[PDB]
Amino acid sequence: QVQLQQSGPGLVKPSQTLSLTCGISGDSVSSDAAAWDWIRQSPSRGLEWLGRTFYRSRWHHDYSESVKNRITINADTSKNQFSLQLTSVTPEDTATYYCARAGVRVFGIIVNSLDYWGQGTLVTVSSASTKGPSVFPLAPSSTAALGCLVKDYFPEPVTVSWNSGALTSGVHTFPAVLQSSGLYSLSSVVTVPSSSLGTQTYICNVNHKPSNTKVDKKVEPKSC
Amino acid sequence: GLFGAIAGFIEGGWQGMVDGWYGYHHSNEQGSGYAADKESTQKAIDGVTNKVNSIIDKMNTQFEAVGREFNNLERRIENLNKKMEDGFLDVWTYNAELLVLMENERTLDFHDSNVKNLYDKVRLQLRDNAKELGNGCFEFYHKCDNECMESIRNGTYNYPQYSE
Amino acid sequence: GLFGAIAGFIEGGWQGMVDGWYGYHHSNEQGSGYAADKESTQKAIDGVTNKVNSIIDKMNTQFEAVGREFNNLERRIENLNKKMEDGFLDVWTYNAELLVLMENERTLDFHDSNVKNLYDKVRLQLRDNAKELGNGCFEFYHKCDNECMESIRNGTYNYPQYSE
Amino acid sequence: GLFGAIAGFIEGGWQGMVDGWYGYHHSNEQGSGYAADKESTQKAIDGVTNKVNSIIDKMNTQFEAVGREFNNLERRIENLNKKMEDGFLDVWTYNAELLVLMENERTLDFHDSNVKNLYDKVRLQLRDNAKELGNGCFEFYHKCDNECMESIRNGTYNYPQYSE
Amino acid sequence: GNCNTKCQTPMGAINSSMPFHNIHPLTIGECPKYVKSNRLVLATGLRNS
Amino acid sequence: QDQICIGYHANNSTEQVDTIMEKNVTVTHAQDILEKTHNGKLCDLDGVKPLILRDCSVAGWLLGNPMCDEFINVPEWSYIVEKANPTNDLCYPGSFNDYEELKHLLSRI
Amino acid sequence: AIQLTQSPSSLSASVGDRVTITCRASQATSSYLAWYQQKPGKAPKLLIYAASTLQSGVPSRFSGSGSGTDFTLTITSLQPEDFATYYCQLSKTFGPGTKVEIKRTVAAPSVFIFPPSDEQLKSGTASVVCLLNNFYPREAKVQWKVDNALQSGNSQESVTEQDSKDSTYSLSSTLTLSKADYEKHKVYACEVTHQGLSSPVTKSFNRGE
């Protein structure tokens, strides 16, 4: 069916220009039976409706009040995408941004209940600079558990996997914690039968795209 | 329409409204913006939904013409059956068509009534602080920001604002 | 309603009126008092009485299902009779229900029309000597006693009264 | 009527209008004269013509009672036929009478709507340059000749005329 | 034909949800009421502009 | 100079309805309620197959016409279907007394 | 503009039990209301719109009702996957959201402790972690013990969301200190107390073996 795939840099300097772009597949951004909204969710404010575009005879832009004159949404039929452009970003914008397709109607009129969503883009604003993560092994003790400690990176998020995604069962990926130094850190653990401690190789795969860092670390028990 | 709002003293409909059949378009220093008067749209949606349900359930015992076979020397009773079923189907077609036509009429006029009533709701608050520009717009004689417009929308406009 | 008076630009009905469906509530130095606009109430009463008489006399030849007995080898003609009477009773039930519904609609809207027309009758006399307070009331810009109100009621308001 | 124009805030009809159901009667230094608002009259004429065509063509398959003869020992089936035809003719008489009544209602109210809408069309242009005399007339606060009246008729009244 | 429907007419089946239809008088199933009309549209919106 | 305006929804639609005073009124969104399509196949009813008499009349099936050996044993059915004018009929001529009444009885079995 | 309230602000029930949420809108617009589900880390997912109509693809165990100012969302038999934050929206504004929590039987965790790696010993800092796996409820208390001395203010912990299959929690507690201060100590132990345990469980190791 329909798919909305988001993109845009997760780090944006204060007072600068934030720019996200939601690419559409499965419909037309020039559809006469839908509208395209931008939503933001933060633990402080919850879900807030930011903006909307659509096309009936001209291109129509419907913005919110909390972003009066501060937001602009565009639709490009040449790529079948629509774009969020937010000026003068401040610390209050740190949130997860979703592009949605408002398009379940009731007697032809669109109620705005969002119908499809993009996988969301976390966006933080700060004076800090990007920092690549360091990945450290967590070896099983001599039924067994092992894992990875990712330390000293910025900003969120970070993607972690095991054996290029081959291992799914028993994996636990932890919500990161902000360190006093202003840096992020978390851990990823997995439990396995101890019998496979010597025969099964466990490769930890980490990706931090703002730093463009991709690291694979084999974790073995400590010998001596 | 029958009340004169649609295609009348208001010229035509806004392509830029997508979330309601009726609404406002406010323009002040804080910009311009469309808003849907949800409550009146819900009255209209209930109207139409109940109308569709009425149409479906009011003719839920219409007539079912079951076939009866007759021989060659029962032409009279066969013709009785034939024209009986024919007449019942004709009268029920008549009923369905009349319901459809009269409901289209009443529904279009209901929408016209709603637009005129919304214009009147705005005017009855704005009584003298504003002036009618004759096509559905109201010129404010004072300066009033977005919360003024919100108070007008939800129906709590406070008349003490000095206006000269 | 469809015209916007009842539960509209007039908020709600007066418990204190008992002798008419519509009326006035005047308040001057000579006190306050309700009065019934009898003529409009009589128009409405005639409307409803003629509607009830129409409902009674328009379906005074409906259908009377008399019973016919048949033997065991006349199943076809018996079923013909059975579903014929069934269909006639269904169609006449349909007619009765539609009449009742459509008349309820028209009657509620008739009352709304009458209230709006009375408000308009008062406004069209009081044109500039008074001001609309937005909820059905009119503020008099001059001093006018109970005979002023009576002239407004029976419809002879004399416009030459100096009003500043 | 239901909208309050005919036999309402306008007292009665003009014998001097012969070429339209609605119209204007202008009186300035260039004389007095009646004019017919043709467009609204054409809307009404189309309304009535389509109504008559609907009445004729909506009951163009009513029921035709063909005669069937029966013997003395077919009293049951003969009575079945008799009361079947009787019931069909009764129900179709009912339908014809209801259509006639409801259309008379809707047509009278349509004419009332048209008169009120024309008065409102004039008022919405003349907004402040004129004053309502309460019975369908508008007093011009400026001097305006026959082309003023023509611009009012065809709907292009230009508001910038100084009026004190 | 090897189907399965919930109504049957002597000239086809009706896999439909509307309240009326105009295929053929004699049916069987939980299917709509026969009507001799060629169009039954109901207006939900409002007059266009 | 602030100003507020009241309006209503509209679109690029063309769906037309009929009124008792006006034909071919164009509205915004309308709902068709009349069905006009069939598949043309004698399809099952609630899963239980019909009894499609191929070329036999009801009388032929019941009496057991030799050219009707298709219907020596019938499973339960939902509705009986026969051609307008069957060709396999009472092959030896004659009549079937109160034929139509037995058809009526069949309509309930 | 319009303000929505949502009740309760949180709840807890077991599998199979019927739960109900209430969204009170200051306005009565029956349809325009819509209920979304949000699992941790994923966008919302429209469950109900027009307050009584169901979106295609949603199990029938959800049902919206109500009118006037009060709308309700009823789940007839919970699931380990229905654990989530439920939101109600009124045409452009979302309610604060309620947290549907899975109540189950108590579970004893598996406790592991992982010492600082020599790579971190190069860095000058030492971080030990205590991982608590597959337990319930959220209630769990951890003690850090070095040379039988109690620690405070030098550790911090983070728990995962309630699992989607068996509805248990999991936790990491990080004790980070200077490497010289680490070398001054020998014994390091993590001590867990929990309703899932009949006795406090200590796991301990010594620096260097």
Residue numbers in the entry:
A (entry chain K): 1 to 35, 35A, 35B, 36 to 52, 52A, 52B, 53 to 82, 82A, ...
B (entry chain B), C (entry chain D), D (entry chain F): 335 to 498
E (entry chain A): 276 to 324
F (entry chain A): 4 to 112
G (entry chain L): 1 to 91, 96 to 213
Sentences copied from the publication:
The VH6-1 class of antibodies includes some of the broadest and most potent antibodies that neutralize influenza A virus. Here, we elicit and isolate anti-idiotype antibodies against germline versions of VH6-1 antibodies, use these to sort human leukocytes, and isolate a new VH6-1-class member, antibody L5A7, which potently neutralized diverse group 1 and group 2 influenza A strains. While its heavy chain derived from the canonical IGHV6-1 heavy chain gene used by the class, L5A7 utilized a light chain gene, IGKV1-9, which had not been previously observed in other VH6-1-class antibodies. Antibodies of this class show characteristic immunoglobulin sequence features, such as the use of the IGHV6-1 gene and the presence of an “FG” motif in the third heavy chain-complementary determining region (CDR H3).
The cryo-EM structure of L5A7 in complex with Indonesia 2005 hemagglutinin revealed a nearly identical binding mode to other VH6-1-class members. As expected, L5A7.5 bound to HA in a similar mode to MEDI8852. The heavy chain structures of both antibodies and their interactions with HA were nearly identical. Overlaying the HAs of the two complexes, the Fab heavy chains of L5A7.5 and MEDI8852 had an RMSD of 1.216 Å for all atoms. Remarkably, the light chains of the two antibodies, which originated from different V genes but with very similar sequences, have an RMSD of only 1.467 Å for all non-hydrogen atoms when superimposing HAs. Interactions between the L5A7.5 Fab and HA can be divided into three regions: (i) the FG motif residing in CDR H3, (ii) the CDR H1, and (iii) the CDR L1. For L5A7, Phe52HC had hydrophobic interactions with Val352HA, and Arg52BHC bound to the backbone carbonyl of Gly350HA. Most notably, the light chain interactions between both MEDI8852 and L5A7.5 towards HA were nearly perfectly conserved, even though the two antibodies originated from different light chain genes. When bound to HA, L5A7.5 primarily interacted with a helical region of HA, centered around residue Ile379HA of Indo05. The L5A7.5 CDR L1 interactions with HA were dominated by the side chain of Tyr32LC from L5A7.5 being held in a hydrophobic pocket formed by Val100D, Ile100B, and Thr375 on HA.
